Design a protein around this nucleic acid. Sequence first.
DNA 1: ATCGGCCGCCATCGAGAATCCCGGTGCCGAGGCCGCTCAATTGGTCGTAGACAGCTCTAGCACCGCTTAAACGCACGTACGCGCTGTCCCCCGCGTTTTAACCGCCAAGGGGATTACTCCCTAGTCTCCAGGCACGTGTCAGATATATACATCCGATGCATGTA
DNA 2: ATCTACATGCATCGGATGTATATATCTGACACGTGCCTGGAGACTAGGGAGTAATCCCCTTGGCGGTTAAAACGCGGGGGACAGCGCGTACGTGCGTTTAAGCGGTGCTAGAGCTGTCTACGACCAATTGAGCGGCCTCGGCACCGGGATTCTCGATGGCGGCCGAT
Lengths: 76, 103, 104, 80, 82, 93, 94, 98, 97
Amino acid sequence: SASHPTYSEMIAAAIRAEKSRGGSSRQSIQKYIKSHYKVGHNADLQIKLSIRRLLAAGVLKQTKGVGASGSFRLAK
Amino acid sequence: SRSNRAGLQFPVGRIHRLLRKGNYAERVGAGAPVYLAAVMEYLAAEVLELAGNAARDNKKTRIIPRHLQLAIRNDEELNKLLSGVTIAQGGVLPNIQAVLLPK
Amino acid sequence: KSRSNRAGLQFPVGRIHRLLRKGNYAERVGAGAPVYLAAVMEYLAAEVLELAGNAARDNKKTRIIPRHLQLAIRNDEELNKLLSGVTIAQGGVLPNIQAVLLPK
Amino acid sequence: RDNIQGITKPAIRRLARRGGVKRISGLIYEETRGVLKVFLENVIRDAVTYTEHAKRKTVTAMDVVYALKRQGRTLYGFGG
Amino acid sequence: VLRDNIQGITKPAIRRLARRGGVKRISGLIYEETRGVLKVFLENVIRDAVTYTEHAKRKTVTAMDVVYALKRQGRTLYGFGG
Amino acid sequence: KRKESYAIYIYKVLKQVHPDTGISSKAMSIMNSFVNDIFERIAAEASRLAHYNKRSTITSREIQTAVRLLLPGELAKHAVSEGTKAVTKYTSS
Amino acid sequence: RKRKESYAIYIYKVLKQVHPDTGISSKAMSIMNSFVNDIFERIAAEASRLAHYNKRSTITSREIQTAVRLLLPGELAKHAVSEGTKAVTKYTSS
Amino acid sequence: PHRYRPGTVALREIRRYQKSTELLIRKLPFQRLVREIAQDFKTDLRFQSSAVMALQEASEAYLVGLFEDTNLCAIHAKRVTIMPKDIQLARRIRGERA
Amino acid sequence: PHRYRPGTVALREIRRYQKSTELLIRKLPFQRLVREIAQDFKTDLRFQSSAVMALQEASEAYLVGLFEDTNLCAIHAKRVTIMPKDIQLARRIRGER
DNA sequence: ATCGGCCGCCATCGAGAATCCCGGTGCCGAGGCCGCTCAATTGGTCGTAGACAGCTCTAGCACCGCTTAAACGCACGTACGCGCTGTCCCCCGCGTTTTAACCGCCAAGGGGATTACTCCCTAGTCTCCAGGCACGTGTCAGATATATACATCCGATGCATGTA
DNA sequence: ATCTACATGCATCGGATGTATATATCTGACACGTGCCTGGAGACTAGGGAGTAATCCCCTTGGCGGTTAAAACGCGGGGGACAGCGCGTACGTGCGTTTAAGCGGTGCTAGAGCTGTCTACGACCAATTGAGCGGCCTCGGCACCGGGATTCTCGATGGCGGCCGAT
């Protein structure tokens, strides 16, 4: 029952942290999720599934890749 | 007879005739067909024993070719000798790679 | 006079006749068999020597070396199939590099 | 070119299952037919030469065994 | 009482043989694996050659012994006779 | 019309190891094909062995060297023992 | 020393037949000699088994032709049979 | 309905046909193939019943061994499916085709 | 301060050593290896000079052919590096085991 | 935002290390020559392998007709093929230090190599005969069958989870 | 917003599959007995291959001092090994219909095969001489070296298009 913020807000803070013009890769987000926040085994699953949602609604923007395999950048 | 004298079941006399008529050499030694009969009997006994174990393991009183294939490939020594020979109606040893089985 | 000249071969038909009788291959040896073998050996020998000869002239060296012999056999599909079980001493390998290894 | 198509899809599927493969690609079925025709052609090439040497018009089981023996793959049980 | 002379096969030597084979990159574990394979091969080949030598009642192993042994192994060698 | 085989002798050895074991007709043919190959293999090598050393006779000594080459170490060790043992008993009486 | 038979002279003549101006090294000559010896033992053994398979007490020219068709690839066997049968005809002619 | 997933029945098929020695190729079409191929080398060929069977026994053994060797190539590639690439590789290393 | 990329000197060595027929293994250590192993089967063995040369030619040829088959296995795995997995695979398909 | 600002991706130029192509030159070894000799050749003779005609009679080719079981066209869709990409440390480049192969010469004798001499070993021949094979005749081990026993496999239900 | 109520992942249980196990019985192939015959054993003689001792002498093993090319060691890091998303679709599975294979008929006869006859062929052999090989020695093709000529490799450098966060 570890306490940690939103998974829609945790991937948002990890894209803001490292400023890369190509973007912040999803796998790097995880390292920021389990080093700045207390998460469990289920983290990697929902991090992938969090990318599934806010990618199609317009919250996130694809840059070089497909789905949660490539990279992305937080839409303005 | 000479088979009883050598203490072998395989016919040394028959082996002697084929060695003289088989164009292997001009003359055939007296102890060569005896040696060969012993060698032939030993190898046949080895094959027959592993195949004999294979017949009782299948709960069958009579040995079939399936038992022959199983004996050679499961025996390290026997598989190396016969590696170049395919046994008719032998099938393959039941082997399945671990990568195909699901979690 | 000799049988090698009569058959029109350089390889010794007389030697082949002697070798066929003493090699324990059969009780009796035909009259035309050692002639046939000499023709076959000379033909096969001629193929290897010409492809190795072209391999020697391609290297600007008249004298044939085992390297030239290996190049001739392995580049010929028929010869490679025949000699697939034979290793040529000092032959080296055909300079071959798979295209996936080269950078781009 | 007519009966080489006689080797059916489920026949090839069973042989590969005995080999131990779970799934088979679609292009494999034709590749195997080519290899088998070539294989048979070589073996039959050697077998027919044995048959022609004995001046017979009938191919004995002994022809296949010797042909296989020359190719390096020896077959047991048929007049070995 | 083994003085292992199999370590006498150096890393750059194995590197060169693989270069002649046409490989671009070599794993670190290959060097030990090759020494094992080479030891087994020679052990088998030397076993057969020496048996030919013992059959000829010689205390010396001729090159002809190696040629006959290799021919039985399936690898026939040209240039040293036979 | 008369045609010789090893069928009878193979069956006897079969009854020596396992008395309670038959043998189908197909497997007996397999055993016969197996026997012919072993003869031809060792005898050819023995012939080449006699031909390599420039000897005009194939002796019992030629058979032992051929066996040590073809068979694996353990099988070769055991086969040589039974062979040499049988030869001594044959030359006895 | 004792005189030991070889195939060096016959190989050398054929060398001048194909290439008059080309030579060969001693090692490569040994390779050619080992190759020739191998071919002899190979074809003759297969021919010996052919006479034994067909219950013949003599090895004839007909057995050698069949053995060549078995061992050699298609193109080389066709040509090799032509040269073989041609040389035999010329031998029985003189 | 009781519909099974893919590959389990295949695995059951693996065990079934590895346990069985019966010939997996239909007899009559293979014979006609033997007739067809043999007609190239010689015309009006007669074939013993045991002669065609020897060709059939040898063929299935050769193909099956290749499929095991082919399976290993696919598995070495981290693949569960066999492909023509694995077959061509296996034959090249065998020495049949260069 | 000149440095070649990673994957060029190796390739130049490939072309270099494929064009050359010289023996790539040092002669003296190979002889001592032959002596030690041969000492297992028999003691006080004599070896011809031509005999040792034959062993080295056959070995390098066997290894080179093997290295081509091993290279193909590594490439078939979508790999540029050879690994013991490729060696064990190549020997298994060969039939040596 | 319009932006200078600024990390990403791009192409011709320029060392600069490497292979190539040139003549020059030194040296082992191919290629021509010669004498010893042992093996190819020739002429002569019989025995038998085998070429070949004719007879025996088996076995391969053939159409005939039904009986299912294997083959076939199809629909539905699910696990996996497989490029893209991310991320991590294996292994190439290679400089520096270290190691011992390689040379070259050669000292010594183990033992391969050959010769010569004595005789046991083995084919050949002849007579004798029994182990072994063709064949007629038997019954039990096992292929087949339908039933009972049961081993997997996948739908089915569920606390478990944060979800929008 | 909070409460209710859906999508998702990994164990527990269910019938429902094809599998397995069994008794009983149909059957044809394995097992058993006999005359027939030519192949194995026994006798005997001949002779030549081989064991053996003696001698030759080619060559293998053992040695050492120097050079220097090869190896070992080390560190840096490039780009290749590797799991996941995921998008995609080719497979497998399971139906109904379709095809013709397997079985069971005998008829016909091409063609394998045993046989008797004896002629063409090659083993056997003695005298013979040259093909062909052991030794020797020249010299030109080739391995080697220095050099420039040339391909190729890759950091350095200016140019440029897509997109942040800053002034």
